[PDB]
Amino acid sequence: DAPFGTLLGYAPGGVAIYSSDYSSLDPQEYEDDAVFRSYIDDEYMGHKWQAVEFARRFLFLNYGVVFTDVGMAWEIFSLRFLREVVNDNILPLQAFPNGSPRAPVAGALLIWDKGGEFKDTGHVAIITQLHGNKVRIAEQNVIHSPLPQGQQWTRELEMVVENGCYTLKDTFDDTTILGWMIQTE
Numbered sequence: 001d002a003p004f005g006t007l008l009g010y011a012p013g014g015v016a017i018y019s020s021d022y023s024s025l026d027p028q029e030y031e032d033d034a035v036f037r038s039y040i041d042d043e044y045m046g047h048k049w050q051a052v053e054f055a056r057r058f059l060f061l062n063y064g065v066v067f068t069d070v071g072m073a074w075e076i077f078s079l080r081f082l083r084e085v086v087n088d089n090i091l092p093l094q095a096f097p098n099g100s101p102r103a104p105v106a107g108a109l110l111i112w113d114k115g116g117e118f119k120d121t122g123h124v125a126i127i128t129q130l131h132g133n134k135v136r137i138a139e140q141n142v143i144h145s146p147l148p149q150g151q152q153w154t155r156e157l158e159m160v161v162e163n164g165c166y167t168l169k170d171t172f173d174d175t176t177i178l179g180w181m182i183q184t185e
């Protein structure tokens, strides 16, 4: 909806979300040129303006941590540590599959496996708010249109809480949510 790089709004903590609609520019030039590389004070955030770039920038700006570089977003679910940028300390990161008895929390990484709408890249978003039966998430490269005034999330997902288990339902019908990740030993 909005041209590539357009500010669409902000996620909690004042983290910018940009349109990543690269349907008007050279694809090869898109993956090779350094102008598509996002940084914050020499710290590499990711590729403009993919889902991984946003997730890493959000953690960096709000928690002072980052997860390692990955080729595909679904690979984040296999990571087991976060790195504290200020001193390079390593912190444990745990993965909780969808339907887990461990409830997600605000600020948690939500990972999608490759499949359906997220073909072979999968996806990653940040869970921003938890409610009775829904969670609000913030993400890049899904919504490319400006967000409503005061709205600091991109999508709302239904959350089913049954028999002590938490299951998130995506807005898409052909996708697969791997689960969420929280900083813990």
Ligand SMILES: NCCCCNCCCNC(=O)CNC(=O)[C@H](CS)NC(=O)CCC(N)C(=O)O
Pocket: 045, 046, 047, 050, 051, 052, 053, 068, 069, 070, 071, 072, 073, 074, 117, 118, 119, 121, 122, 123, 124, 140, 141, 142
């Ligand atoms: N025409 C159909 C378009 C379908 C678009 N679906 C977008 C789904 C949103 N998910 C993503 O953006 C996840 N993208 C990715 O996983 C891409 C693969 S190039 N990987 C990265 O951005 C990571 C690059 C990296 N090395 C890093 O560490 O930051």
